[PDB]
């Protein structure tokens, strides 16, 4: 445990993956060239978790950029920070995955996958002690969906002893109009259940509704949604990047958050919710907000379920007494929403460095049984098409069988049944 290898696949993966490096680069005082220009040495104490230090004391992100089309990666290379990334670490195709999981996993992705793994291997070599892997991707497309999950499976074969963690973007009919998305998403969940240690369920429905109802953006863009995603990614990784006691590594996080191996889908939360365009928040406000439904990055009502485990990260200069007071107040005021059979399931961290333009923030990470709502949604949409076998030719024309679909459908339905099991479980 020390170094994290980051992989970003497909359009969504590369867009959110790019925004991630831009945000934490500024946080750790690294300019678009890779040169350090910060005020604190707290910025470099754990820099090697995400960055490789190179000759002439220049910091290179330990990032692999994957896609089955050049498009997005070209705009990432043309972008502000595209210069920070190692150019040998840009692995792309020309075909595209055409929003088809079968193309990303079996046909087109199959052709590119070993070139990615050679870059994964090279990065893994330059590691004194590799922790595991981080992947950004959407579950609704073809590349990040199909290729991303095949890359996880292949990485797991070569590194079975390491931690596999993902930032998976869930589809919403409010953001996308690609009919096949529920199919790709169910095929991807089946993979995530088996092969990941931790998954941050980033839901496009919740990101859209936050932008519309709370940020009062009439016509939200992808960059608006990605702004909330980059804030969430910066917050959920804090403990890994800065000196600290709680969840300072991927494994310690998993042991605190995962009571049952399939139940590793986290509902991230964030306070204050902001749009890209003064008024500081009190420790009590940060606490009410981070636990509020309106601040969740997954379109689930936490009050409809029970928390199995919670991680709370507070960023900035505040009272550790008051943080502790408010955290205990939240648990003691709503004790029914926290399983009694997992004693002291809420663990809190406080980090002195806040994000850009915020005096203070709070990031929540919850393993709530209410995540079954997101899975019931994708399941409702999948079953509606699959019971009439609609749009399957796109998949069977790639060599897949109805069996894979029936299996994926079953595993996700079983996962929803498991989350219910522990919601109705008493001590």
Partner 1 sequence: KREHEREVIQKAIEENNNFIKMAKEKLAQKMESNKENREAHLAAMLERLQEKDKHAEEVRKNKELKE
Ligand X SMILES: CC[C@H](C)[C@H](NC(=O)[C@@]1(C)CCCN1C)C(=O)N(C)[C@H](C[C@@H](OC(C)=O)c1nc(C(=O)N[C@@H](Cc2ccc(N)cc2)C[C@H](C)C(=O)O)cs1)C(C)C
By rule CB under 6 A, what string of x and - marks binding of each residue 161-180 to ligand X? -------------xx-x---
308 binds, among ligand GDP, partner 1, ligand X, none (CB under 5 to 8 A by kind): none
Q: Does 400 bind partner 1 (CB under 8 A)?
A: yes
Q: Could you tell me how many residues of this chain bind Mg ion (CB under 5 A)?
A: 3
**Minimum distance between the CB of residue 297 and ligand GDP, rounded to whole angstroms?**
10
Enumerate residues 6+ apart whose C-beta is below 8 A from 108.
Answer: 68, 93, 95, 96, 97, 142, 147
**Minimum distance between the CB of residue 110 and partner 1, rounded to whole angstroms?**
6
By rule CB under 6 A, what string of x and - marks binding of each residue 122-161 to ligand X? ----------------------------------------
Among 204, 232, 234, 238, the residue binding ligand GDP under the rule CB under 6 A is 204
Q: What is the 3-state secondary structure (H, E, C) of the chain?
A: CCEEEEEEEHHHHHHHHHHHHHHHHHHCCECCCCEECCCCHHHCCCHHHCEEEECCCEEEECEEEEECCCHHHHHHHHCCCCCCCCHHHEEECCCCCCCCHHHHHHHHHHHHHHHHHHHHHHHHHCCCCEEEEEEEEECCCCHHHHHHHHHHHHHHHHCCCCEEEEEEEECCCCCCCCCCHHHHHHHHHHHHHHHCCEEEEEEHHHHHHHHHHHCCCCCCCHHHHHHHHHHHHHHHHHHHHCCCCCCCCHHHHHHHHCCCCCCCEEEEEEECCCCCCCCCCCHHHHHHHHCCHHHECCCCCHHHCCEEEEEEEEEECCCHHHHHHHHHHHHHHCHHHECCCCCCCEEEEEECCCCCCCCEEEEEEEEEHHHHHHHHHHHHHHHHHHCCCCCCHHHHCCCCCHHHHHHHHHHHHHHHHHHHHCCCCCC
Residue 398 or 418 with smaller CB distance to partner 1: 398
Say whether 97 counts as a known binding-site residue.
Answer: yes
Give the C-alpha separation, 66 to 88, whole Å: 11
Q: Does 292 bind Mg ion (CB under 5 A)?
A: yes
Among 82, 93, 171, 366, the residue binding ligand GDP under the rule CB under 6 A is 171
> Phi-psi category of 272—alpha, beta or left, where left has phi over 0 and alpha has psi -120 to 50?
beta
**Minimum distance between the CB of residue 175 and ligand X, rounded to whole angstroms?**
4
219 binds, among ligand X, ligand GDP, Mg ion, none (CB under 5 to 8 A by kind): ligand X
Q: Could you tell me how many residues of this chain bind ligand X (CB under 6 A)?
A: 12
Say whether 175 counts as a known binding-site residue.
Answer: yes
Q: Does 220 bind ligand X (CB under 6 A)?
A: yes
Residue 26 or 285 with smaller CB distance to ligand X: 26
Say whether 29 counts as a known binding-site residue.
Answer: no
Q: Does 293 bind Mg ion (CB under 5 A)?
A: yes
Say whether 12 counts as a known binding-site residue.
Answer: yes
376 binds, among partner 1, Mg ion, ligand X, none (CB under 5 to 8 A by kind): none
Residue 181 or 198 with smaller CB distance to ligand GDP: 181
Q: Does 34 bind ligand GDP (CB under 6 A)?
A: no
Tokens linked to 328: 């205990």
**Minimum distance between the CB of residue 53 and ligand GDP, rounded to whole angstroms?**
30
By rule CB under 5 A, what string of x and - marks binding of each residue 11-50 to Mg ion? x---------------------------------------
174 binds, among ligand X, ligand GDP, partner 1, none (CB under 5 to 8 A by kind): ligand X
Residues 268 and 200: beta-carbon distance below 8 Å: yes
Among 112, 130, 169, 312, the residue binding ligand GDP under the rule CB under 6 A is 169
**Minimum distance between the CB of residue 305 and Mg ion, rounded to whole angstroms?**
12
Which one of 163-171, 221-229, 352-360, 365-373 is the stretch in contact with ligand X (CB under 6 A)?
221-229
350 binds, among ligand GDP, partner 1, ligand X, none (CB under 5 to 8 A by kind): none
Give the C-alpha separation, 292 to 240, whole Å: 25
Query: Binding site membership for Mg(2+): which residues?
Result: 67, 69
């Amino acid at each position: 445990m020390r170094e994290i290898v980051h992989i970003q696949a497909g359009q969504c993966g590369n867009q959110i993956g790019a925004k991630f490096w831009e945000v934490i680069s500024d946080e750790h005082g690294i300019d678009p060239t890779g040169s350090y220009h910060g005020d604190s040495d707290l910025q470099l104490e754990r820099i090697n978790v995400y960055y490789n230090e190179a000759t002439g004391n220049k910091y290179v992100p330990r990032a692999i950029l994957v896609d089955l089309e050049p498009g997005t990666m070209d705009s990432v290379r043309s972008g502000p920070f595209g210069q920070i990334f190692r150019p040998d670490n840009f692995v792309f195709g020309q075909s595209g995955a055409g929003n088809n999981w079968a193309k990303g996993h079996y046909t087109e992705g199959a052709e590119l996958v070993d070139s990615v793994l050679d870059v994964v291997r090279k990065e893994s070599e330059s590691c004194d002690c590799l922790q595991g892997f981080q992947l950004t991707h959407s579950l609704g497309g073809g590349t990040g969906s199909g290729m991303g999950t095949l890359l996880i499976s292949k990485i797991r074969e070569e590194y079975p002893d390491r931690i596999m963690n993902t930032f998976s973007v869930m589809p919403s009919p409010k953001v996308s109009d690609t009919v096949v998305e529920p199919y790709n998403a169910t095929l991807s969940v089946h993979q995530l259940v088996e092969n990941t240690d931790e998954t941050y369920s980033i839901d496009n429905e919740a990101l859209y509704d936050i932008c519309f109802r709370t940020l009062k953006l009439t016509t939200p863009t992808y960059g608006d949604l990605n702004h909330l995603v980059s804030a969430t990614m910066s917050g959920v990784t804090t403990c890994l990047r800065f000196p600290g006691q709680l969840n300072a590594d991927l494994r310690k996080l998993a042991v605190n958050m995962v009571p049952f191996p399939r139940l590793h889908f986290f509902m991230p939360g964030f306070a204050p919710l902001t749009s890209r365009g003064y008024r500081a928040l009190t420790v009590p406000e940060l606490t009410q907000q981070m636990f509020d439904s309106k601040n969740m990055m997954a379109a689930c009502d936490p009050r409809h379920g029970r928390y199995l485990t919670v991680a709370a990260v507070f960023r900035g200069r505040m009272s550790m007494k008051e943080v502790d007071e408010q955290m205990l107040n939240v648990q003691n005021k709503n004790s029914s929403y926290f399983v009694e059979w997992i004693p002291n399931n809420v663990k809190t961290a406080v980090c002195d460095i806040p994000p850009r333009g915020l005096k203070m923030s709070a990031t929540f990470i919850g393993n709530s049984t209410a995540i079954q709502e997101l899975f019931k949604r994708i399941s409702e949409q999948f079953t509606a098409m699959f019971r009439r076998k609609a749009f399957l030719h796109w998949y069977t024309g790639e060599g897949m069988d109805e069996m894979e679909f029936t299996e994926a459908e079953s595993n996700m339905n079983d996962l929803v049944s498991e989350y219910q099991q522990y919601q109705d479980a008493t001590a």
